[PDB]
């Protein structure tokens, strides 16, 4: 590394379109009704779980809640979408293909 | 000099050569309120030396532990202070010979 | 100058520059000079308070008043807690000014009177007399509390008890008899051990391996 | 394929620290520089007071919720605060003997700040500076443990 | 220009505009911005100058310094009064058995059977005669108030209002010049507040006849019914 | 001291000396022997 003599402050190349487009690309498909959910959606059931768990606000969710499943799958897909979106944006902007 | 043309060794700049750097230290004097700084500079005056702080530690700790043995272990209701409150394992010296 | 036992050789730091220097520091607590200044001020303060306390216990036990180890449990015009509160509150400023006077002068003072000397009788002779009477009064107060702990009587009733039968009413016929007897015996034979230390190492001062002493020097 | 993130420290590939986002991200360096440990211009006694307040307030919690008297209702907080006081005192003694041990050599090499301006040495790394740092640590630690007890006594939702 | 910690006043070293609002022409006045013509002799070099000489009694400087003396002496006496009026009532509501803790009836305690118990205790003062009390008061106060004007054992050539030697500044708060000049106007403002409050104590004792802390409790219980106006019908001329 | 053979320790002697020997004297000793071993010859 003959270059990189200062650790640039813009080490992550922030384009504010990336988080928005990742949230959009995961969440809008996350609101499509599938019969496995009974005609509902992953994100819809997630918001419903948060609504039920916000009712008893101080105490936390249970272990058999089925809230954790929705949370973990939604965030798996969401973080993957946002991560690949940043990667693709800074691969199209930079080289890498 | 040092930072250009990959000249990573300079006798006139031995700090940059050896790596004697302050990665995060700043030398700004404007941190704490002067009333608070005065309070906490005066509150530590009598112990701002090594031997005096060790004297305070010795005094306070000897006192705390001695009064712990005298009253504090009792106030904590430690079992060693209450005693067995029973007969104990006196008569059961052994499974064969139940000694005292 | 006289010494704490006859023919005693003083430590190298107790060279008689200060008053009351009888060469007494077998534990070498006064090897540091600033520590020695602080310890002198502490000696004179403990001694001033013990002088006042000894004369106060004497004045109290001289008349029909509660005993000095039970006088705190009496009923007064103020509550216990507000008493302690106002005490701490005024002694804040009092001892702060006294500590400031020590830092400035090196001796005691009331608030601003660096030398509390209304009647200008301050002298080295009076300093030595204050120090000597203060040491004597610290011993006297310790004895008050000690022979009020063995007996249930204060200073002068115990003194009258000793005067009633001097041989049978003394410290060696009480519960603390044996330990004081052996302690006095050891303290009488100690100076000859110390004098052997001084004799067989002629002129060479020895370091007693103490933490406060920095004995590695 | 451009824009490599990982750089050597201050551009020097032979010192061996490899400036990295966890090391020298703007927010991370900002946070570490603002900590009282790295305020090399303020008096070490006050930085010690602040560090000690923090550490004495945090380390009461474990003794309170997990100590031997954690299950007796009101004795728990008293016991844990006294335990944290003892641990703070031990740490203050540690700091004092560390100041006795470390600061005897006064190394003559200077200090820069990754941008060239030769700052002065931190007075904290001196015998008197560390003495007053441990003094501040004791004062602040005992005060922080006391206030931890107070917060157990006065906070509304303290469960 | 100025950062956040300087606006809060974190650093007490660079405060030089602290006396600018209480001394000098750019200071606070009595009617604030509604007081344009400050009296030209009240130039603000003395503590407590809010530009208030509306009756004009202090135009001459000799009369002005005598009135400053009278103001500070009345200020300190009313400060000691307003501390010494409420504190018997505060300690009676504490539980200390003071038998007549209101200040306007505390002088009649010396006409009781057991004399004047100080904190309600016979082990305390226990003064019986008003005559010897007033005699030792007039002797002690004659000595002290005669030492006050031309010096004595606690200072001789010091200032007539602020001696501050080893007896009247023993704690040493007024060693600094700026701290002394700031605590002067602090003293005279607390003293004017206590003078106003002692006038309130006088009028409240006259028209109500109850305790000032009793007046505070009867205003805390009912503020709108038990104000100063429910006793406004007490001096109607029949 | 005590009735019978004198120099019997009190009932509270263990409660004091076990904490001393175990918390205090080791603290003093390890501090002293730390400052000794890190001390530099002039
Ligand atoms: C801009 C608005 C402003 C107003 C209206 C006032 C008003 C006043 N300030 Mg000021 N101030 C103001 C700004 C400021 N003041 C101050 C700091 C001070 C101080 C330190 C002092 C004052 C004082 C005064 C008073 C001086 C005149 C007086 O004695 O009236 C007296 C006359 C009345 C108040 C009217 C009479 C009362 C009632 C309404 C009528 C009577 C009612 C009864 C029912 C009558 C019955 C009685 C019968 C039986 C005879 C006056 C009330 C002085 C004071 O407090 O004097 C009392 C004083 O010491 N001010 C500062 C800080 C720099 C200000 C900043 O803007
Ligand atoms: C800032 C919001 C907040 C607050 C005040 C609390 C507060 C609390 N939580 Mg909750 N919790 C939170 C966020 C929060 N949690 C989140 C984001 C998750 C995920 C959880 C998951 C969670 C579980 C799984 C449990 C708690 C429990 C608790 C209680 C003991 C800890 C306490 C009242 C426990 C409880 O009391 O039940 C418990 O079992 N929390
Ligand atoms: C608490 C008050 C006090 C203090 C602070 C003293 C301090 C001092 N004295 Mg003193 N002194 C005192 C009380 C004293 C009393 C009561 C006596 C009469 C017995 C004396 C008699 C005396 C003489 C004759 C001489 C001194 C000297 C000194 C100096 C050197 C000693 C030193 O470094 O140890 C400093 C001492 C301490 C830090 C106190 C430590 C307390 C220990 C750890 C507790 C146990 C003490 C003891 C066993 C309990 C009392 C039992 C009793 C029956 C003996 C120092 C300034 C010498 C000097 O140069 O002046 C000297 O020649 N002193
Ligand atoms: C101010 C010094 C002083 C004086 C004058 C006395 C005097 C007396 N004590 Mg007290 N005493 C003192 C200090 C003093 N003691 C101290 C420091 C302790 C703590 C150890 C005690 C503990 C104590 C107990 C427990 C008992 C006495 C008893 C007595 C009486 C018999 C002597 C005896 O057996 O004890 C001998 C005392 C000691 C071994 C303590 C050390 C005394 C030092 C060395 C000072 C000696 C006097 C000094 C050289 C000159 C005094 C000055 C002046 C008054 C002439 C006698 C009235 C006994 C008594 O009255 O029972 C009826 C008794 O039971 N005393
Ligand atoms: C005995 C009390 C007393 C005395 C001698 C003074 C004297 C003085 N004051 Mg102070 N003052 C007082 C009480 C007093 N005041 C009180 C209670 C307040 C609060 C309301 C103030 C508020 C005040 C301000 C804000 C200012 C002064 C100022 C002054 C000076 C010029 C004004 C003047 O001529 O007043 C002469 C006063 C008298 C002759 C008192 C007469 C009292 C009669 C009986 C009327 C009282 C009745 C009334 C309802 C109350 C002068 C040194 C000004 C100054 O330059 O300060 C340095 C100024 O700015 N005073
Ligand atoms: C102008 C100052 C002043 C004056 C003239 C008085 C006058 C009086 N006070 Mg007050 N007092 C004052 C200031 C003053 N006090 C202050 C500043 C405090 C707060 C510390 C008090 C706290 C106080 C209490 C708590 C009590 C009095 C009492 C008394 C009375 C008995 C005097 C006595 O024996 O005290 C001289 C005694 C000593 C100095 C001891 C007398 C009417 C007592 C009383 O009977 O009043 C109801 C009473 O209970 N005063
Ligand atoms: C709260 C009101 C107040 C304030 C701010 C001051 C401020 C000042 N006074 Mg004044 N003074 C006052 C009330 C006050 N005084 C009263 C009521 C008296 C009469 C007892 C005096 C008598 C007096 C004299 C004779 C002298 C001063 C001096 C001073 C100066 C230095 C001392 C100081 O800073 O005190 C600061 C004050 C406080 C921090 C208030 C503390 C209140 C305590 C905690 C309550 C105690 C009450 C007590 C029981 C009352 C009985 C005594 C400063 C200008 C000296 C001076 O000018 O030196 C150059 C000087 O010579 N004053
Ligand atoms: C060198 C051999 C030896 C050994 C291994 C022990 C071992 C022990 N002693 Mg014993 N002890 C000894 C000699 C010994 N002692 C002697 C010679 C004395 C007379 C001074 C004592 C007087 C003594 C007392 C009075 C106490 C102990 C106690 C203890 C225990 C805790 C250690 C402690 O606090 O030490 C303390 C050491 C000393 C006080 C002096 C040592 C010299 C431990 C079982 C304590 C105990 O029984 O707790 C259960 C206790 O209270 N010891
Ligand atoms: C450099 C010198 C410094 C000196 C500073 C001044 C010290 C003043 C000490 C207190 C003196 C008050 C005595 C007044 C006359 C009482 C006569 C009488 O009959 O007593 C009678 C009283 C007992 O009378 C009892 O009074 C009680 C009060 O609530 C109860 O009411 C009881 O019922 C009653 O019997 O005897 C005493 O109280 C004497 C005690 C004196 C010592 C008190 C403790 C003080 C120790 C620390 C001193 C600190 C000094 C600094 C603080 C002050 C700073 C200015
Ligand atoms: C400024 C001006 C300006 C314009 O121009 C003009 C004019 C208007 C004129 C002016 C004004 C003035 C004024 C306001 C005045 C006022 C004053 C006062 C109020 C005072 C008080 C004053 C007050 C006071 C002294 C008070 C004091 C007090 C005292 C001593 C004490 C008392 C007491 C007590 C403790 C309690 C007991 O039981 C008893 C007794 C004994 C009772």
Swiss-Prot record, chain B:
The chain crosses the membrane at residues 55-73. The lineage of its organism: Eukaryota, Viridiplantae, Chlorophyta, core chlorophytes, Chlorophyceae. The chain holds residues 31 to 130 of 130 of the full protein. GO terms for biological process: photosynthesis. GO terms for cellular component: chloroplast thylakoid membrane; photosystem I reaction center. This is Photosystem I reaction center subunit VI, chloroplastic. Residues 75-100 are annotated as: Disordered. Its main location: plastid. The keyword Membrane applies. It is a single-pass membrane protein. Belongs to the psaH family. Keywords: Chloroplast, Membrane, Photosynthesis, Photosystem I, Plastid, Thylakoid, Transit peptide, Transmembrane, Transmembrane helix.
